[model samples]
Target: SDLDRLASRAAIQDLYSDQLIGVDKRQEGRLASIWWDDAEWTVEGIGTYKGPEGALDLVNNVVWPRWHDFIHYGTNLRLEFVSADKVNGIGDVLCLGNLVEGNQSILIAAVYTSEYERRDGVWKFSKLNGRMNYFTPLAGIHFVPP
Candidate 1:
């Protein structure tokens, strides 16, 4: 039983980490949605990202390749079980530091809340959302959404 619990916790952590990688690497496979206010779908907060592919393209095209590096830290995981296969949790993330190819370090921070679901022995993120709590730029590169 303890092993099962530990495995469950590890599985949850892995899923969360994958979500971060999906963003950091700009992998197109990751998807998420957020509901900021209440459980009711009406007060929902929803947005979709195609991953870092677009971001990387911009960095390589518009900005110089020496702009910055993305370092992500996911912490403060709080998981509450809704059922055997579903849970909800919240956590904080820090873009702790970055290294531009020829530049110095940059740091940023964010806070996140999420819901997850496990089905057919595979864990997938059903929803996840975040807000930037603090950030600082170490370079002049600006991210203007396209």
Candidate 2:
């Protein structure tokens, strides 16, 4: 049904937003909710993690210690329906963050190729592959928390 398709797309869209917000805001519960129990997330140069626990480990142990704060802008999402309960999507991603040390800023340009599945009427990421285009450091830029 057309209505069902539209609703599915909307739910998937919200999942994308939730994932990024969870990362930027340091909300572990919010972030973990975006992934399935057996999901996989692969980030360029950061290796691959398995499941929601792996995702949390990546953020808590790897990301937070290096970045004081960051913002992820995921745009131009194109979702492809694989089935009534499965979808694949790709989105342009840009992230900017300040380092915990040296007051240095870093910018990452990437795209996420993702797969999502609906379980019991809830959509969550089954896989997310982040292909990085740029990992550049910007000198002399300072980020202040408001």
Candidate 3:
């Protein structure tokens, strides 16, 4: 039981890294793979999305298309095991990007409160809620887009 918990945590940690890096690199298939079939993702102002397609669309259609040179930095993450096959976690994220329209630099700080489930020996996000702490435009700084 303890061993399963340790392995599950490690797998979930990798899942978080995979999700963030996959998003930054625009890895659609990889991004889509991290979510459970019936998962829900809720962004603060943006509405909740259902299923893996919803998560994929959130990146490709909604977030990624709006930014250039976007990067997500995961700062801290803490996990709580709910059961042998379920975990709850809170992760701090800091992100920066340039807008597609203006190339204006923006900073975003948020917390990802998530629930993870292990099914068929794979760990995936069952639910994720994003709450923003800051979403500010750097007035004096601008970005150069390639």
Candidate 4:
């Protein structure tokens, strides 16, 4: 039992960590390694990406262009095994960074609901979905961290 549980945890954790790194660095190759060939990814305020090509589209045309740089702060992770090779995960991420085209903080955050599927003894993202509940630089709205 311990061995099975340990294996599950390790696989899921690796899947989660790789995704954060992929987005932070905007590395498509890294993404290719982690996402499935026909994964479905949906992001609120952005759009949906279907398959590997769409995933690459999101990374290049949407994901990469938005942030000058960002630090992903993920919390409240919940991972459940659907089968020996499938899992579902939900969590929150705080993105504190800036926009490449603007000179201000992109300062936002969101919750992520994701799914993973392991194939050929490796885990890959099957569905990556998120809804951004927080955002930044609203007109005439500023918090002076006091």
Top model number, lDDT: 2
Tens-digit lDDT track of model 4 for 1-146: 77977887777777777778877887667666777878898987688898667877887888777666777888888988888788889998988776666456666778899998878877778998988887875444432347
Model 3 Cα shift for residue 113 (angstroms): 0.5
lDDT for model 4 comes to: 0.78
**Candidate 4 displacement at residue 102 in angstroms:** 4.3
Give the better candidate number (1 or 3) by lDDT.
Answer: 3
Measured with C-alpha atoms, the lDDT of residue 48 in candidate 2 is 90
Residue 69, model 4, lDDT? 73
Residue 129 in candidate 1 has what lDDT? 63
lDDT string for model 2 (14-106, tens) is 988888899899999888888998999988788999888999999899888998789999999999999888999999999998987777888
Across 10-78, the per-residue lDDT of candidate 1 in tens digits comes to: 877777786677556645454132111222211123334222343334334443344454657888988
Q: What shift in Å separates residue 82 of candidate 1 from its native position after superposition?
A: 1.9
Which scores better on TM-score, 3 or 4?
3
Clashing pairs in 2: none
Candidate 4 colliding pairs: none
Residue 64, model 3: Cα distance from true site in angstroms: 1.5
- Position 103, candidate 4: lDDT: 55
The count of backbone overlaps in candidate 3 is: 0
Cα lDDT of all candidates, in order? 0.58, 0.90, 0.88, 0.78
Q: Name the lDDT value of residue 138 in candidate 4.
A: 46
Q: Rank the candidates by lDDT, best first.
A: 2, 3, 4, 1
